[PDB]
């Protein structure tokens, strides 16, 4: 059909998908309009991604299906209807909520009733935790954070205990997981400061101060990430950037452990005599990079807070546009760096100097090789490269002038044109995403909540290492969802009678009606 008539085939597919995605057909003929709406929104999103033509119609259709699902949830008026909708499964589960989270239905989850049910489940067995003074909230969060190990060992000893069931509350579970991570960060911060030994040992023996306490927690992290790779699939793992950074951090910790035990078993002398590629130095640097990756995970902990969760979510939204512009910056940087290298690399000098490169007391050989030129042009954005790098030790004034001109031109670009373009583009992007920040934050917070809702992973990171029932559920879901469909079509017809709109067709309709009545009267009378 594409080879015969491509336009006819594409328009036919668009009309078929526009007919299937109508709210009325879905509410009348589809047996499971929630699942039908979810699958149709997903399929129209894939059609918009694949068919770059007709993309606006496809994303409008997907938005219309999401609108239909949100309105259908808005037509609920009882808690039991919400419980029988969200816990319904095809074959406390919240299976439909899991599937709606999977299908990226943002305004479905961010509905007030679903938020109310999830907040009721989140503060399990809590006599009005939200109805508290903020100071009392702070001290009670502090005291659940402090007693994390006693609740952990209470769950390990007696699961039936009230303290053993205290960790099963998702809020207390989240508090204890944050306490474990904060204690891990405090252990690393002590590892930076408590260390006061020779720091000259050739092999770097593992101390009992911080090591063997970082080690278990690291392999507990590894086991947890392996479990989340197995449970939920690889696609859900790579969908979130936070899990990718967690995997990178765990790989760096494993590399540091491997390098440290290699230094224990091999090459076991002043510190200045070490080679630049010694295994202990590589372990040191990899531990440092893993530490700067581990201490940034507290940003992922900030989606739960109401005052700044939308802010963190908005920054996460426009980070992609930041990378979008950094590609253009990389092209400019490569262009000017290799141009300046092609100019100055005939003037390479050593002269037995103490230091070479830009990172010396006096800058020299800045534009010597391509690596040094890229480093020197990168640091020029922040002004840490002085102006005496552009002149040569010889007296070739013309090459010095054209090198300074190229350097100044690149500085003008990457400090007036591209940075201010980035500011304006960020301005428009945050203006666009300011309206959708609330539903995005609610969706991310519900994903974080439902991460802790499952039975598995209850233990924290120290201790990580039938047909009749189906028919009854189907009939309950069918009767509740029939009531929902009837309420939704009544409300949609009422809104159709409510919208402030009168075309010129209806004035002509009244005119034709009154003229017909007049002509009937004149025919009769």
């Amino acid at each position: 059909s594409s080879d015969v008539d491509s336009l006819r085939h594409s328009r036919s597919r668009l009309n078929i998908y526009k007919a299937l995605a109508s709210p009325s057909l879905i509410a009348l003929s589809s047996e499971d309009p929630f699942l039908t709406a979810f699958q149709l929104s997903w399929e129209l999103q894939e059609l918009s991604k694949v068919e770059n033509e007709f993309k606006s119609e496809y994303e409008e259709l997907s938005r219309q299906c999401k609108q239909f699902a949100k309105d259908l949830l808005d037509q609920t008026r009882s808690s039991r209807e919400l419980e029988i909708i969200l816990n319904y499964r095809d074959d406390n589960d919240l299976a439909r909520l899991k599937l709606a989270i999977k299908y990226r239905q943002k305004e479905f989850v961010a509905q007030p009733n679903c938020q109310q049910l999830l907040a009721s489940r989140w503060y399990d067995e809590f006599p009005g935790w939200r109805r508290r003074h903020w100071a009392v909230k702070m001290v009670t969060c502090f005291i659940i954070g402090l007693l994390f190990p006693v609740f952990s060992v209470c769950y390990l000893i007696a699961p039936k205990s009230p303290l053993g069931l205290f960790i099963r509350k998702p809020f207390i579970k989240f508090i204890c997981h944050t306490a474990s991570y904060l204690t891990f960060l405090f252990l690393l911060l002590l590892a930076s400061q408590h260390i006061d030994r020779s720091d000259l040992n050739r092999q770097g023996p593992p101390p009992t101060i911080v090591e063997w306490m970082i080690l278990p927690w690291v392999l507990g992290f590894i086991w947890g990430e392996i479990k989340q790779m197995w449970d939920g699939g690889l696609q859900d793992y790579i969908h979130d950037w936070w899990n990718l950074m967690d995997f990178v951090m765990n790989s760096l910790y494993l590399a540091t452990i491997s390098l440290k035990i290699v230094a224990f078993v091999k090459y076991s002398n002043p510190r200045e005599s070490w080679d630049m590629w010694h295994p202990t130095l590589v372990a040191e640097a990899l531990f440092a990079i893993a530490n700067i990756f581990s201490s940034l995970r507290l940003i992922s902990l900030f989606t739960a807070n109401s005052h700044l969760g939308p802010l963190q979510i908005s920054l996460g939204r426009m980070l992609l546009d930041i990378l979008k512009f950094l590609f253009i910056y990389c092209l400019v940087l490569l262009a000017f760096a290799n141009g300046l290298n092609q100019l100055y690399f005939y003037y390479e000098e050593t002269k037995g100097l103490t230091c070479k490169g830009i990172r010396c007391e006096k800058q020299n050989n800045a534009f010597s090789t391509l690596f040094e030129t890229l480093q020197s042009l990168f640091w020029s954005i922040f002004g840490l490269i002085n102006l005496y790098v552009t002149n040569v030790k010889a007296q070739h004034e013309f090459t010095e002038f054209v090198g300074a001109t190229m350097f100044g031109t690149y500085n003008v670009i990457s400090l007036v044109v591209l940075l201010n373009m980035l500011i304006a583009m960020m301005n428009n992007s945050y203006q666009l995403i300011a309206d959708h920040a609330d539903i995005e934050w609610k969706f991310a917070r519900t994903k974080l909540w439902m991460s802790y809702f499952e039975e598995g992973g209850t233990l924290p990171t120290p201790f990580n290492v039938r047909a009749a029932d189906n028919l009854r559920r189907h009939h309950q879901y069918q009767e509740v969802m029939r009531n929902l469909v009837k309420r939704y079509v009544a409300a949609m017809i009422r809104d159709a009678k409510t919208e402030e709109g009168l075309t010129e067709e209806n004035f002509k309709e009244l005119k034709q009606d009154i003229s017909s009545f007049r002509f009937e009267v004149l025919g009769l009378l």
């Binding site: 336009l7 006819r8 770059n52 033509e53 690399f345 005939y346």
Partner: protein, 305 residues
């Protein structure tokens, strides 16, 4: 206003019925003058009544820019819309005093052309109205030439351009993004083989590979990337004692480099000769290519000297 004929007002209210009864009565509007016409009349009407003359010209060009009058009395409404949009943009450039009105009429002509092409149903009809000259795409070449932004951004025209651009492998869009990436890569590696096999045997399937315009763009981008890699290779192999000796000497890399330079200057000559010079000067990319070629030619001339 006293200068307004009934047919001009009929085109102003844009009703098709009033037009289709009025032009049955053998009605013709006055012909407006050119962009810079300063004849014995045009230099006298400005002296006579400048505001009256300007309002008469605006009324005439609002009468002509109506979609009803374009669709009724012209041989080709698409061509009339293109020419009228270009003429109205030029007048808005000239007539500083009425920039908004002439710009709005140009926008209305462009929108009419966009919608008139949007009423195409069959792909055969789209091919007919895009290949018309007074795969060849002469009408689309005119539409890009006349700077019609709405005409070419239409879904049907863009879809036809996608089917022409992708060539034989129309399922390339059906492929996932990883498969598109590795397909682009594996064409980017063996591009000289494809160019040579086209230069030798264009009859076979690899001979017809280069006639795919997406593929032609891929070998063109890979050729420029190979030129860039040879440029880095010059500095990586800059050890012909040139760092010290005064007299320039050309290596194999510089031989290939000047071969690429004469190839790019030959492509520049072909662009200047087949398409012209003004459209070359319009594009900033072609200006960048010209300054690049002048700089490289001066570099090699000074090297030889």
């Amino acid at each position: 206003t006293m200068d307004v004929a009934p047919v001009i007002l009929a085109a102003h209210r844009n009703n098709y019925e009033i037009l289709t009864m009025l032009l049955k009565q053998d009605v013709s509007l006055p012909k407006p003058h050119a962009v810079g016409c300063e004849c014995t009349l045009c230099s006298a009407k400005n002296k006579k009544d400048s505001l009256r003359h300007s309002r008469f010209r605006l009324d005439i060009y609002r009468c002509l820019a109506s979609p009803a009058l374009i669709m009724l009395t012209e041989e080709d409404p698409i061509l009339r819309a293109f020419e009228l949009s270009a003429d109205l943009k030029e007048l808005s450039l000239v007539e500083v005093e009425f920039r908004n009105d002439y710009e709005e009429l140009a926008r209305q002509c462009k929108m009419f052309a966009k919608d008139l092409l949007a009423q195409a149903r069959n792909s055969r009809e789209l091919e007919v109205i895009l290949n018309h000259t007074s795969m060849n795409l002469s009408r689309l070449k005119l539409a890009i030439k006349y700077n019609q932004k709405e005409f070419v951004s239409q879904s049907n025209c863009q879809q036809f351009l996608n089917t022409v651009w992708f060539g034989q492998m129309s399922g390339y869009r059906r492929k996932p993004t990883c498969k598109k990436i590795m397909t682009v890569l594996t064409v980017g590696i063996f591009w000289p083989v494809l160019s040579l096999c086209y230069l030798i045997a264009p009859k076979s399937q690899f001979g017809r590979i280069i006639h795919t315009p997406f593929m032609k763009f891929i070998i063109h981008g890979a050729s420029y990337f190979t030129f860039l890699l040879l440029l880095n290779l010059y500095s990586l192999v800059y050890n012909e004692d040139k760092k010290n000796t005064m007299g320039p000497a050309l290596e194999r890399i510089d031989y290939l480099l000047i071969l690429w330079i004469i190839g790019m200057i030959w492509s520049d000559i072909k662009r200047l000769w087949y398409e012209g010079l003004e459209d070359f000067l319009e594009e900033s990319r072609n200006q960048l290519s010209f300054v690049m070629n002048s700089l490289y030619l001066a570099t090699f001339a000074l090297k030889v000297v």
